[PDB]
RNA sequence: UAGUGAACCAGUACCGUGAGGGAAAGGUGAAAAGCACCCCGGAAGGGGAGUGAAAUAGAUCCUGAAACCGUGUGCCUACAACAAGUCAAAGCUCGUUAAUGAGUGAUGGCGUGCCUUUUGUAGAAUGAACCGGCGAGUUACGAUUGCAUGCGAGGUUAAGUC
RNA sequence: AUCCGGGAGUCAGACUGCGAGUGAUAAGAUCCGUAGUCGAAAGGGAAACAGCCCAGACCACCAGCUAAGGUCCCAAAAUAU
RNA sequence: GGUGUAGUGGUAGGAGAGCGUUCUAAGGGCGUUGAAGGUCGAUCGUGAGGACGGCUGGAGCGCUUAGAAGUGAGAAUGCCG
């Protein structure tokens, strides 16, 4: 009942190495050091699936900043006026409307001018 | 009942512990014994009483 | 119809780093000039690749090709052969090994 | 023809004759889907969105029920002993678009 | 992966602006100028591409230094040799090399990427009141900032 | 690398004056039919032509992984401080177990490896040159509890004979 | 929460509000009583930072709101009244 | 099966369910019209892991239920090549 260790280890180690195509050194072809940056790549993937959302809110805020300042409104009085006008647009949608549709962004800008004018 | 369809009595033949066989089984790296001390050496433990 | 005869020489008793120096100077040239190129380098790896190219020319004549004046050295390799292993008595009792290495050399002679 | 439609938590830009990749909708393939909350109607004369602009039904049909790629989310903590291993693969429904307000 | 604009290199047109400096302090000139060059005041960011503009400066430098700091803000350079600190400047750079004031107190205001170099070579600082760059038709800003 | 130390001309070669210590080394093909003859070279070695179902089965001879050494080419690279990844992304090249495709990657954000021992580690505490193979809670006889089974005021054989 | 029974690890703790000694009414010193965090806890802030202030991640999203702390540029938001 | 409400960081350690290797038994199978082994692929499951296809290979091996273990490697200034 002598059991050798025939073909298990190759299957493990090559499933590791296919996760490591394109590593900028001898981290293609060394088993002890390929099994480490895969671990750190998983830590960084856990971080970075949660810093997508930290990033794009800052980008859409900056684009809302520029396009709002073009119409004589600072970048927060839009927020307070649009909530007094009871409008619930996501910051993505105001970002790309602020880039493309100048007419629509000025229409929302004038209703936000009218809202807090009371 | 015949040879190729055997069934045991339920709840009546357990499996085992295989101790010191990997960190996520629960009992690898010091095998259920812990850190240093003479209970964790080879054949340690004082006599009874 | 085939061109590009081959010629090898296996387990040549020369070190494989040094023979890659000479084959820097041959890849991509005409045959009739590269022999003259080989005849002036003063190395042990000079007087071997001569014999490889001349056997490749003789293969292309007596087997397939024509037109010796229209042959181009297209490919040339250096690979490592098996290594002998011996020792040397170094001072204060001990000993340190000595490798002795061998190489395989191939040259392919296309027409154009 | 713009339409900005609340679907789930998210907001989507909508045109005529495209596809949107949205979450599950409990509707068989295939059939008709009628979204209701519409903020904007664009184009030329912008219907500015008071929340639930009235009389704004955006219709559509369904093509598949499919899944994204896996998301290998392994956690470890160094110089200690831990392995949590998962795999997650959400379902997805394509949405053809037809017939903004007319 | 969905729809937000990621501008390319040759999509955004650039402009040319002219800014005076008659009796405005350093920090606020440098702040408005450095917020110009990254591409702010334009709704079409990337954090990749030079979406910024070109800025020309007239009358370097006549910049104020508020209260004191005429003789006080000592700059410092060290020359990687022993004892080589050279505090050679003061507020003396108002008189000589008034190019060199704004080319330091704006380079500090920028990032230090490679874009903090391609966005720095768009300044032009002149202590006098002349454009050699009149071939490019620059416009005028108004600073109430 | 198992199984005697040893499947092979082994207590042999080798080491110590001596008592003594002690290795490594299996495999062509069904059949040797083991490459007549020609060609370069002093030969070794190769290229044709043959033998053979197969010669990348040519005597180091079944299959032939990894480190390691080379050749050719799709994309990038000479104002740049980089635990070497990951998120975002232009361009160029390609076309799959057809699907929210594959290769590369100018550029921006963020980011001090792996074990062990510790009140505490990136540590200038301690271990690994790299790859492959071997390499650690078992068994016998007793004791105690949980679960299951057959009988139950009863239960049950040992040594030993066929 | 109590009782009966099977199975262990632990006996080198640390700093910070507090309140007391020996110290010189000194120390990231030492020795105890009380509460928290680290040990066995990842995310935000104090430039970076085990123990301080806020808050305890089953997983995905290019959705929304607030705490501690912030709003001239790096670097997100007031050159606010 | 619905539908609600609640919970789901974690070292030493306690408990439960599974993946994988070699052999034995019984049933049922595959294989010179290509088995094991090797290489490549843009595939499936929550996990260890499992299929199918292209090439190389040239004689044996999976599948279901039960049983027995020389049953799983990255670290010992580990041993051998």
Short mmCIF file of N, CA, C and O (backbone and C1' of nucleotides) in Angstrom, two decimals, chain D residues 9-10 23 71 73 75 77 80 84 86 88 90 92, chain G residues 38-42 57-64:
data_model
loop_
_atom_site.label_atom_id
_atom_site.label_comp_id
_atom_site.label_asym_id
_atom_site.label_seq_id
_atom_site.Cartn_x
_atom_site.Cartn_y
_atom_site.Cartn_z
N UNK D 9 -30.43 49.93 -8.05
CA UNK D 9 -29.79 51.07 -7.43
C UNK D 9 -29.24 52.07 -8.41
O UNK D 9 -28.97 53.21 -8.04
N UNK D 10 -29.09 51.69 -9.67
CA UNK D 10 -28.28 52.43 -10.62
C UNK D 10 -29.16 53.26 -11.54
O UNK D 10 -30.37 53.04 -11.64
N UNK D 23 -29.37 43.75 -14.02
CA UNK D 23 -29.46 42.65 -13.07
C UNK D 23 -30.71 41.82 -13.37
O UNK D 23 -31.34 41.97 -14.42
N UNK D 71 -14.82 35.99 -9.84
CA UNK D 71 -14.11 37.02 -9.09
C UNK D 71 -13.46 36.29 -7.92
O UNK D 71 -14.11 36.04 -6.90
N UNK D 73 -11.81 35.87 -4.81
CA UNK D 73 -11.61 36.76 -3.67
C UNK D 73 -10.99 35.97 -2.53
O UNK D 73 -11.70 35.50 -1.64
N UNK D 75 -8.61 35.80 0.82
CA UNK D 75 -8.05 36.59 1.90
C UNK D 75 -7.02 35.78 2.67
O UNK D 75 -7.14 34.57 2.81
N UNK D 77 -3.86 36.54 6.00
CA UNK D 77 -3.27 37.51 6.91
C UNK D 77 -1.87 37.03 7.27
O UNK D 77 -1.70 35.89 7.73
N UNK D 80 0.38 34.64 10.22
CA UNK D 80 -0.65 33.93 10.95
C UNK D 80 -1.24 32.94 9.96
O UNK D 80 -0.70 32.76 8.86
N UNK D 84 -9.42 32.12 3.40
CA UNK D 84 -10.80 32.07 2.96
C UNK D 84 -10.77 32.12 1.45
O UNK D 84 -10.03 32.90 0.87
N UNK D 86 -13.24 32.02 -2.14
CA UNK D 86 -14.58 32.07 -2.69
C UNK D 86 -14.51 32.14 -4.20
O UNK D 86 -13.46 31.91 -4.82
N UNK D 88 -17.41 34.19 -7.16
CA UNK D 88 -18.71 34.83 -7.25
C UNK D 88 -18.98 35.14 -8.71
O UNK D 88 -18.08 35.56 -9.44
N UNK D 90 -22.24 36.65 -10.83
CA UNK D 90 -23.60 37.17 -10.82
C UNK D 90 -24.37 36.83 -12.09
O UNK D 90 -23.79 36.59 -13.14
N UNK D 92 -27.05 38.00 -15.16
CA UNK D 92 -27.23 39.22 -15.93
C UNK D 92 -28.28 39.02 -17.01
O UNK D 92 -28.36 37.96 -17.63
P C G 38 -8.72 46.07 18.59
"O5'" C G 38 -7.17 45.77 18.82
"C5'" C G 38 -6.20 46.29 17.94
"C4'" C G 38 -4.79 46.10 18.46
"C3'" C G 38 -4.27 44.69 18.54
"O3'" C G 38 -3.83 44.21 17.29
"C1'" C G 38 -3.68 45.86 20.50
P G G 39 -4.03 42.67 16.91
"O5'" G G 39 -3.33 41.87 18.09
"C5'" G G 39 -1.93 41.65 18.09
"C4'" G G 39 -1.51 40.89 19.32
"C3'" G G 39 -1.95 39.44 19.36
"O3'" G G 39 -1.00 38.62 18.72
"C1'" G G 39 -2.46 40.50 21.42
P A G 40 -1.44 37.24 18.04
"O5'" A G 40 -2.94 37.49 17.62
"C5'" A G 40 -3.50 36.74 16.55
"C4'" A G 40 -4.98 36.94 16.45
"C3'" A G 40 -5.45 38.38 16.28
"O3'" A G 40 -6.55 38.38 15.39
"C1'" A G 40 -6.51 37.42 18.13
P A G 41 -6.35 38.88 13.88
"O5'" A G 41 -7.00 40.33 13.88
"C5'" A G 41 -6.20 41.51 13.85
"C4'" A G 41 -6.93 42.59 13.11
"C3'" A G 41 -6.67 44.03 13.55
"O3'" A G 41 -6.79 44.88 12.42
"C1'" A G 41 -8.95 43.54 13.77
P A G 42 -5.66 45.96 12.02
"O5'" A G 42 -5.98 46.27 10.50
"C5'" A G 42 -5.49 45.42 9.47
"C4'" A G 42 -6.55 45.02 8.47
"C3'" A G 42 -7.24 46.12 7.70
"O3'" A G 42 -6.46 46.65 6.64
"C1'" A G 42 -8.85 44.57 8.42
P A G 57 -18.51 44.34 10.12
"O5'" A G 57 -17.75 44.43 8.73
"C5'" A G 57 -18.48 44.46 7.52
"C4'" A G 57 -17.68 43.86 6.40
"C3'" A G 57 -17.50 42.36 6.47
"O3'" A G 57 -18.59 41.68 5.89
"C1'" A G 57 -15.43 43.41 6.01
P C G 58 -19.48 40.70 6.77
"O5'" C G 58 -19.50 39.35 5.93
"C5'" C G 58 -18.37 38.50 5.90
"C4'" C G 58 -18.54 37.43 4.85
"C3'" C G 58 -18.44 37.91 3.42
"O3'" C G 58 -17.11 38.07 2.97
"C1'" C G 58 -20.33 36.52 3.65
P C G 59 -16.67 39.38 2.16
"O5'" C G 59 -17.41 39.25 0.76
"C5'" C G 59 -16.92 38.35 -0.21
"C4'" C G 59 -17.80 38.32 -1.42
"C3'" C G 59 -17.94 39.62 -2.18
"O3'" C G 59 -16.85 39.88 -3.03
"C1'" C G 59 -20.04 38.56 -1.96
P A G 60 -16.55 41.38 -3.52
"O5'" A G 60 -17.61 41.64 -4.67
"C5'" A G 60 -17.54 40.94 -5.89
"C4'" A G 60 -18.70 41.30 -6.77
"C3'" A G 60 -18.85 42.78 -7.08
"O3'" A G 60 -18.03 43.17 -8.16
"C1'" A G 60 -20.94 41.85 -6.48
P C G 61 -17.43 44.65 -8.23
"O5'" C G 61 -18.69 45.56 -8.54
"C5'" C G 61 -19.33 45.48 -9.80
"C4'" C G 61 -20.46 46.46 -9.91
"C3'" C G 61 -20.14 47.87 -9.46
"O3'" C G 61 -19.46 48.60 -10.47
"C1'" C G 61 -22.28 47.21 -8.67
P C G 62 -17.90 48.93 -10.33
"O5'" C G 62 -17.81 50.43 -10.80
"C5'" C G 62 -18.35 51.44 -9.96
"C4'" C G 62 -19.04 52.53 -10.74
"C3'" C G 62 -20.37 52.16 -11.39
"O3'" C G 62 -21.16 53.34 -11.39
"C1'" C G 62 -18.89 52.95 -13.02
P A G 63 -22.72 53.29 -11.03
"O5'" A G 63 -22.76 53.49 -9.46
"C5'" A G 63 -22.99 54.77 -8.90
"C4'" A G 63 -24.43 54.94 -8.48
"C3'" A G 63 -24.67 55.80 -7.26
"O3'" A G 63 -24.74 57.17 -7.58
"C1'" A G 63 -25.87 53.77 -7.06
P G G 64 -24.25 58.28 -6.55
"O5'" G G 64 -25.32 58.25 -5.38
"C5'" G G 64 -26.26 59.30 -5.23
"C4'" G G 64 -27.17 59.06 -4.06
"C3'" G G 64 -26.67 59.57 -2.72
"O3'" G G 64 -26.94 60.95 -2.51
"C1'" G G 64 -27.39 57.35 -2.47
#
